Design a protein around this ligand. Structure first.
Ligand SMILES: Oc1cccc(Cl)c1
Ligand SMILES: Oc1cccc(Cl)c1
Ligand code: SF4
Ligand code: SF4
Ligand code: SF4
Ligand code: SF4
Lengths: 443, 419
């Protein structure tokens, strides 16, 4: 029986309700607490023992590997030119991303209003962003916005009501008068608040999201399997990087579509809130031991971005295809993790360190240990994603009655450069899995 | 598809036939820019820049619940959604085509880009190349081109006949808000200099700029078949933003490999000629490059570089002989812009470059239909055999970037077909 991704999603659909289990110690999480930004984790030694911002120490390791003809830690390249080429591809992939994630809200690409954008100015005579909505029916709007999402580069798209528990209490950002070249030295915190205002607006003191901001649209941006399977080496860094620029394009495209439909839209990429939780509530997939959203189509080998809006929409149903029970017995990511960051224990409500948000039931991982491996390896690792059985393209089988996971699944870089590739790194052997008709956009 | 393209490869040599009269063509002569064609009436009889008159028709259509000229939408909501999708598609494109060289997204150096600055401590853009072998470089850069969103990619030596003699641009310190009102003409010249450079007087391409890399960016078939209505405008628009990201991504890769790279999108030179010389397809009666995978339903962009590369062979799969007897685009064109006659070396008007054997079309007649219809037409692309209602499009099949899984296998690539 030929694989039917739509059938699979329908088979495992849940009844409505946020799947994330929480208790009374839950409070919104200040973004500065992530390992990338917090002072306790931001600094890492380089290979000479010099203590630096982690990404500068990682740069030192990239340079060292190129000079030594390596594609990764102790991984010899074919020659220096191949080592150089992998890092050139990685660096280029980030072209449309600011400071590794686009996290500053309402700066650079992540503007909360389209008014100053060159595209908005060019189109101003038509008045699409000033004319009241011609469609308020959530059913039709869901079909329109999901169609637009696929045009804008999403491989998966889902809708959820906005759960404010996953919106950061304070964002990391920069003052509005700070030019890019000083941005990394002038980062500040700024509260994200919800108020009775008509439009998203930023004051000197606050980023203000309107109380009318009902919905979040979550996109999955598929990474390339062959390149991620080289983790922790450079080609895994390149598929990561290119997908961050795809995320940025998605956010801007979709926000402009929503604005030109007469609503407002807030982009975010890696900023504003916790993408994994939104993705789980929007039904893209389930949380996992490693901490990523695992999808039926791509496993965890998929990036996430999201857009917040007042556009009326129909929320999607969460999905339960057994990930929690497989993660309970699998632990491959924990065993293979080069830094032992991933727990082999049970889920708890108690954060392992400052980097975890306490009060939600999850596997609690040590993300300072994870980040510490990045300067050592000169990359963004990804070994957990690479070894997860759900990342394999071969997991789904049909037994004549229904779909199921094949339990047998759970028991070099020159060839990548010389091997299979297609547009955006997508794989035509599986691309049919993300075909979409109206019936699977809105019910 | 790899079998087909090898089967139809020609021996080396530009297939475009030229004569002694050929001269490089000033970009201002295109119908989009030239003063004789730029102003068009709207439906009220008011003469405006053609795209503003076209805007007025889009507004009139939304108000009247239409997706195109005399084409009722399901309701006003559907009409609005089609124009919202079209407008959004252009997000990463400046003034319909990114033609101003070394402005906005089309910078000729990576030095000021936020990504280059972030990566500066690694020194990839200042380190000499570690690879000079054109075979390996061709494989690397084509792999990168596919990562960067090209559905097709080819390489040719740069033929300066197709580089505009003078570009349309704006002064470097003019802000976006005044760009449309302060467009100027600036020569593109070739000189013995190390790097692409712009002076007050000239855009200077180095004599070492040996090669052009041409990308095909596939449009969506269902949407283009709604031409001249709004969903054909939307697939057009989204692919212009795909073009811009391709140029920037690939230029950065080439720079981080130790070479220089000039992006262009619709600027700098004539994409159809470059695409034919790079083997993506053949010229056609309508004037487009027709590819085996997509026919003419594919957009083009290109990047110029001194990176050593292996030129691809031109391809001949019989387009010329088919266009000789077909004439379907010419009979369906709503403005009679496309000739039914034979190819000549003599342009029909200022908008054509004389001195090259081609079907000569009247591109002022084409542009005149755009304000009338409120869109970018595309009927010629839609009806062409090589290419093979709006509610059904919105309710129907779609996939990532509008690509089609029924055909996506045709653009799979291994090293054997890259070099
Ligand atoms: O969020 C990410 C992911 C990978 C690399 C970096 Cl630097 C940031
Ligand atoms: O080059 C193009 C193509 C379509 C529309 C416009 Cl305005 C320009
Ligand atoms: S490797 Fe195993 S335990 Fe880890 S996330 Fe994947 S399925 Fe779960
Ligand atoms: S990215 Fe690497 S170091 Fe981090 S959790 Fe995954 S396997 Fe461990
Ligand atoms: S775009 Fe339309 S008007 Fe222009 S040549 Fe093609 S069919 Fe004719
Ligand atoms: S419609 Fe016919 S004559 Fe026109 S470009 Fe296509 S094949 Fe050629």
């Amino acid at each position: 029986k030929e694989k039917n991704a739509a059938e699979i999603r329908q088979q495992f659909a849940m009844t409505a309700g946020s799947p994330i289990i929480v208790n009374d110690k839950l409070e919104r999480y200040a973004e500065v607490r992530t390992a990338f930004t917090h002072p306790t984790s931001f600094f890492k030694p380089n290979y000479k023992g010099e203590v630096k911002p982690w990404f500068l120490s990682a740069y030192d390791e990239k340079v060292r590997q190129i000079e030594n003809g390596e594609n990764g830690p102790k991984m010899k390249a074919k020659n220096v030119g191949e080592a150089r080429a992998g890092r050139a591809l990685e660096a280029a992939g980030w072209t449309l991303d600011i400071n590794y994630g686009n996290i500053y809200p309402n700066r650079f690409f992540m503007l909360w209003s389209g008014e100053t954008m060159t595209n908005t100015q060019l189109w101003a005579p038509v008045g699409l962003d000033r004319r009241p909505p011609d469609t308020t029916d959530p059913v039709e709007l869901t079909n329109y916005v999901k169609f637009a999402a696929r045009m804008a580069g999403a491989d998966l798209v889902g809708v959820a009501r906005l759960n404010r528990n996953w919106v950061y209490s304070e964002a990391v950002t920069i003052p509005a008068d700070v030019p890019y070249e000083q941005s990394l030295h002038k980062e500040i915190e700024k509260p994200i608040v919800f108020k009775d205002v008509p439009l998203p607006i930023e004051t000197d003191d606050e980023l203000i999201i309107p109380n009318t901001c009902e919905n979040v649209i979550v996109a999955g941006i598929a990474m390339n399997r062959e390149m991620m399977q080289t983790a922790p080496n450079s080609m895994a860094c390149a598929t990561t990087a290119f997908c961050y620029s795809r995320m940025c394009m998605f956010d801007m495209w979709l926000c402009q579509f929503i604005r030109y439909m007469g609503y407002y839209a807030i982009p975010s990429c890696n900023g504003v809130g916790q993408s994994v939780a939104f993705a789980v509530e929007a039904g893209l997939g389930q949380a996992s031991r490693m901490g990523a959203c695992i999808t039926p189509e791509f496993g965890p080998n998929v990036r996430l971005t999201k857009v917040f809006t007042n556009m009326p929409l129909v929320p999607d149903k969460p999905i339960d295809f057994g990930v929690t029970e497989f993660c309970e017995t699998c632990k491959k990511c924990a065993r293979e993790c080069p830094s032992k960051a991933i727990t082999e224990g049970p889920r708890t409500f108690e954060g392992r360190s400052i980097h975890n948000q306490s009060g939600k039931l999850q596997w609690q991982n040590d993300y300072n240990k994870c980040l510490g491996y990045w300067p050592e390896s000169g990359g963004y690792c990804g070994v957990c994603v690479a070894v997860c059985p759900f990342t394999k393209g071969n997991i789904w089988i049909h037994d004549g009655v229904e779909w199921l996971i094949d339990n047998t699944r759970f028991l070099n870089i020159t060839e990548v450069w010389d091997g299979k590739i297609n547009t955006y790194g997508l794989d035509a052997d599986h691309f049919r899995d993300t075909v979409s008709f109206r019936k699977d956009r809105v019910k």
